[PDB]
Amino acid sequence: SEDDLTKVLNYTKQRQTEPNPEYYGVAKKKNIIKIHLESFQTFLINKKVNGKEVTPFLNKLSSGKEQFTYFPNFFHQTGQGKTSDSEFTMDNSLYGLPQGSAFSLKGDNTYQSLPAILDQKQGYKSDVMHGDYKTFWNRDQVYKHFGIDKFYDATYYDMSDKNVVNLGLKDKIFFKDSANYQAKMKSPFYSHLITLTNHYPFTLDEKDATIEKSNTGDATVDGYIQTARYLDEALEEYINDLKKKGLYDNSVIMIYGDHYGISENHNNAMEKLLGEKITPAKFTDLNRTGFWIKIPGKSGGINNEYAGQVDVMPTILHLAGIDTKNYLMFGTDLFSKGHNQVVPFRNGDFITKDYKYVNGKIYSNKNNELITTQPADFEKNKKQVEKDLEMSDNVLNGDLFRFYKNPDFKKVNPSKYKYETGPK
Numbered sequence: 459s460e461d462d463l464t465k466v467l468n469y470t471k472q473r474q475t476e477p478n479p480e481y482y483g484v485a486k487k488k489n490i491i492k493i494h495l496e497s498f499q500t501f502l503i504n505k506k507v508n509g510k511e512v513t514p515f516l517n518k519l520s521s522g523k524e525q526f527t528y529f530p531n532f533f534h535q536t537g538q539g540k541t542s543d544s545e546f547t548m549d550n551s552l553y554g555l556p557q558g559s560a561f562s563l564k565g566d567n568t569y570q571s572l573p574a575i576l577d578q579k580q581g582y583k584s585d586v587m588h589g590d591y592k593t594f595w596n597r598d599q600v601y602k603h604f605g606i607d608k609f610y611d612a613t614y615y616d617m618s619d620k621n622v623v624n625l626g627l628k629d630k631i632f633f634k635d636s637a638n639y640q641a642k643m644k645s646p647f648y649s650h651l652i653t654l655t656n657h658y659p660f661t662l663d664e665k666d667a668t669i670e671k672s673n674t675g676d677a678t679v680d681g682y683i684q685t686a687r688y689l690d691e692a693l694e695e696y697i698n699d700l701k702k703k704g705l706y707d708n709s710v711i712m713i714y715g716d717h718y719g720i721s722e723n724h725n726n727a728m729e730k731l732l733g734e735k736i737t738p739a740k741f742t743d744l745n746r747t748g749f750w751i752k753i754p755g756k757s758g759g760i761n762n763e764y765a766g767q768v769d770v771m772p773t774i775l776h777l778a779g780i781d782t783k784n785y786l787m788f789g790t791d792l793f794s795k796g797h798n799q800v801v802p803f804r805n806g807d808f809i810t811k812d813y814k815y816v817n818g819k820i821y822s823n824k825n826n827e828l829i830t831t832q833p834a835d836f837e838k839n840k841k842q843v844e845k846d847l848e849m850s851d852n853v854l855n856g857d858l859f860r861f862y863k864n865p866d867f868k869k870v871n872p873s874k875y876k877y878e879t880g881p882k
């Protein structure tokens with residue numbers, strides 16, 4: 459079994475990249491705020507419905523002129539675990555499982571997670587905040603294994619009828635209360651806010667909506683417009699609050715969509731909304747879920763690098779100034795010149811700068827037209843994709859971190875973590 463771990467460790471070595479000296483350590487011991495946008499796809503960015511911008515605040519961030527670096531070619535890599543798969547990957551640079559939920563099935567595995575590394579190396583305290591109860595998606599158990607110090611779950615918010623819609627707390631209340639909790643924290647902290655309102659079936663009380671639905675006739679697509687606007691407004695106000703509380707300028711702030719909100723079931727309506735047929739290649743393009751990052755002392759902009767959620771962990775560690783040579787990670791640092799510009803998807807599809815591989819066919823990204831002559835790097839990339847998924851699965855299925863005596867990681871004792879019931 460130790461041999462199985464050794465094989466994965468050796469496999470992950472070749473891709474390792476050196477940090478960009480422009481970015482290496484620039485955020486050492488600064489607060490890190492990580493903002494999850496439930497079910498958010500970047501087809502919303504710059505989209506108008508009935509003449510109204512769906513997501514005007516995110517549109518401003520996406521211009522690159524508002525201190526955030528926006529990655530328009532940034533993809534989730536989730537499977538059946540959906541939100542929990544995104545969380546898993548964001549904090550571990552590992553894939554979820556091909557079937558089922560890693561959180562639900564592998565919650566008592568040994569991990570060497572991002573929050574634990576930040577805690578150990580730089581004295582961070584890590585928290586998650588979320589307007590649902592802690593045992594949903596097995597978060598209570600998983601987070602203890604990840605070494606997350608605090609979980610402000612629904613018991614930390616007023617869950618009365620007026621404050622909830624669909625699965626739980628409304629995003630506007632959530633962000634307002636969460637900013638207030640964050641202002642009471644000691645630095646350095648690593649805080650992950652997981653939103654909720656922009657979730658299937660995408661329902662919002664009329665009183666809370668500020669944009670009319672689209673008119674495709676598909677209730678999912680049409681409702682998504684309203685919940686996406688609501689989330690955008692909630693986020694805008696959250697950023698305002700951070701500025702008032704002095705938690706904006708000197709924090710690393712990242713924003714990301716977790717996974718797609720609109721499945722292929724909605725191709726008819728999405729063709730109406732977007733004005734083109736949703737082919738398999740087009741659907742793949744629509745799996746862009748976005749990454750925006752603000753780094754203190756650094757200008758924003760637009761970075762066109764093709765990338766996935768696996769890349770976030772090494773990016774954050776390098777920004778902190780932490781040497782990552784001993785961490786078992788599949789991603790590479792977004793800001794490094796050597797960033798591996800190949801994005802595996804959980805189903806074996808993948809994308810690169812020039813082409814996508816979708817259900818056994820290769821398409822040019824320029825026009826989504828079929829490529830008949832196999833690209834020079836295709837075999838290499840296809841192999842990397844297949845092996846990345848297999849190797850990651852081996853870690854989860856073999857619980858392989860049990861066997862890793864890592865010089866740069868102190869084994870987490872999950873019994874040292876407990877999430878007390880909140881005051882509400």
Ligand SMILES: [Mn+2]
Nearest residue numbers: 497540541716
């Ligand atoms: Mn989700």
